[PDB]
Every structure is written in structure tokens, then in C-alpha cells.
Amino acid sequence: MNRGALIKLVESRYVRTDLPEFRPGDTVRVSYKVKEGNRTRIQDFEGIVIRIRRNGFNTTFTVRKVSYGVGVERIFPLHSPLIQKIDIVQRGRARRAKLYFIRNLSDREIRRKLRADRKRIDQDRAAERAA
RNA sequence: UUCCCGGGCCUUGUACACACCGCCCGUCACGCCAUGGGAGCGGGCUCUACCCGAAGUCGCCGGGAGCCUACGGGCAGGCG
Numbered sequence A: 001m002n003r004g005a006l007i008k009l010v011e012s013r014y015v016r017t018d019l020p021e022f023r024p025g026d027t028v029r030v031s032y033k034v035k036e037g038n039r040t041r042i043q044d045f046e047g048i049v050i051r052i053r054r055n056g057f058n059t060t061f062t063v064r065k066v067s068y069g070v071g072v073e074r075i076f077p078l079h080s081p082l083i084q085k086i087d088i089v090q091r092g093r094a095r096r097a098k099l100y101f102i103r104n105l106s107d108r109e110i111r112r113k114l115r116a117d118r119k120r121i122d123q124d125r126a127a128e129r130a131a
Numbered sequence B: 001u002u003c004c005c006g007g008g009c010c011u012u013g014u015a016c017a018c019a020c021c022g023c024c025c026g027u028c029a030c031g032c033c034a035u036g037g038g039a040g041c042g043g044g045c046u047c048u049a050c051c052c053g054a055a056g057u058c059g060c061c062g063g064g065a066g067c068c069u070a071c072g073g074g075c076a077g078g079c080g
């Protein structure tokens, strides 16, 4: 038997392919399904992805933002059915996979440390030319 | 005729005139009032140094690059 393939097989029913590719440092908008009262709604969480934790179907990513003077971090399963869509709002270029360090940085310092990833921005623009 | 008691005349000092049985000082005791000191406690104002920093004018850029061309330009946008 191949235990890995069995697991991949169980996971296959839940795997997602509709979400855009992004890297740590990119700024991302996650439209997330949420439950309140008496209804469910979609709430956008927009911020820098500081971490992508890979384990295939089980990979998760972490998005950090400042909300009314307070740092907030959300952890999302990359294949969650509660993510309606993810929008790339900016491409950042980091020089490491985990950006924990920006927790200690001023907004000004972060803006210096993560400059726009012009290579991947151009790529986005080259695509998005629809036939 | 020094002393005690009463008085008369002259004079002298007096913070006494209720007139020396006068006036009056301070502790202590009780009561009230205001202030000072006092481990500290609370608050107001202020000064200095540094960290972060909105809006905004100003200055640079405006390109791996968008839009308007009015194209040796402008706006977006970026930096300070």
C-alpha cells in the first residue's frame, strides 16, 4: 500500500485550484465567509502574508494587518471552503520565507524593507491580457 | 516719732482711675479657629531628550510602470 497516496486520495475531494498564487511579502485581500447573527456574510481581511506553511492540502498562510491601532494576524487554511476568493493587491519582494520580523517594525521601516516586486508585478500585467 | 493705724502740707515715679482689695505675665487644664512642618497621597501647569507619526503644503522621482497628451508636459503613483 501507499499510505501517502491514500491520504492524498482522501484529501482530493477538498483540494482547491481556483485561488491565485502568492508569496510571503505580497499584500492580499481574503474574502472570508463569516457567521454572525442571524446571518452569514463575507468579510474582507487585507494585509501582508508573512508566512506560508506548506503541507500540501494542509498548507496554511498567515496575513498580518493593522486594525485601528492594533496588529492583527489571521491564519487561513489555503484550501478552506470559507475563503470565497483571494485578491492580490500588491506584490512585495522579501528575501526570506518568514516575515515575523515586521511585527517589530514601524510602517515606514516595513515600507522600506518590502519594496514592490516589479518583476512579478509586470508578470501580473502581462497576464490579465485576455483573449 | 524709727515701727503699727488714721490724717494734713510739699514733692517724686506710675503701664493705676473699678484708682494697690489697682493693673497685669506665662506655663498647665478645657473649648473653639486659622496657619506652619510632616513618611507621603492626589491634581494642574511647564521644560528637556529621544521613538513613532495623520491631514497637508513643499522638495525629489515618476523607472521593470498606468492614464491624458495638451508628449522636453500633466495626473496616478513612489520617496523625503
Ligand SMILES: [Mg+2]
Binding pocket: A003, A004, A007
Ligand atoms: Mg503523510
Ligand SMILES: [Mg+2]
Binding pocket: A002, A005, A006, A009
Ligand atoms: Mg491509491
Ligand SMILES: [Mg+2]
Binding pocket: A043
Ligand atoms: Mg467588517
Ligand SMILES: [Mg+2]
Binding pocket: A047, A048, A064, A065, A066
Ligand atoms: Mg499593514
Ligand SMILES: [Mg+2]
Binding pocket: A033, A081, A083, A084
Ligand atoms: Mg462560497
Ligand SMILES: [Mg+2]
Binding pocket: none
Ligand atoms: Mg501713715
Ligand SMILES: [Mg+2]
Binding pocket: B008, B009
Ligand atoms: Mg496744713
Ligand SMILES: [Mg+2]
Binding pocket: none
Ligand atoms: Mg505722694
Ligand SMILES: [Mg+2]
Binding pocket: B013
Ligand atoms: Mg521711671
Ligand SMILES: [Mg+2]
Binding pocket: none
Ligand atoms: Mg502726676
Ligand SMILES: [Mg+2]
Binding pocket: none
Ligand atoms: Mg494643625
Ligand SMILES: [Mg+2]
Binding pocket: none
Ligand atoms: Mg500643611
Ligand SMILES: [Mg+2]
Binding pocket: none
Ligand atoms: Mg497640617
Ligand SMILES: [Mg+2]
Binding pocket: none
Ligand atoms: Mg506641604
Ligand SMILES: [Mg+2]
Binding pocket: none
Ligand atoms: Mg505630586
Ligand SMILES: [Mg+2]
Binding pocket: none
Ligand atoms: Mg506631580
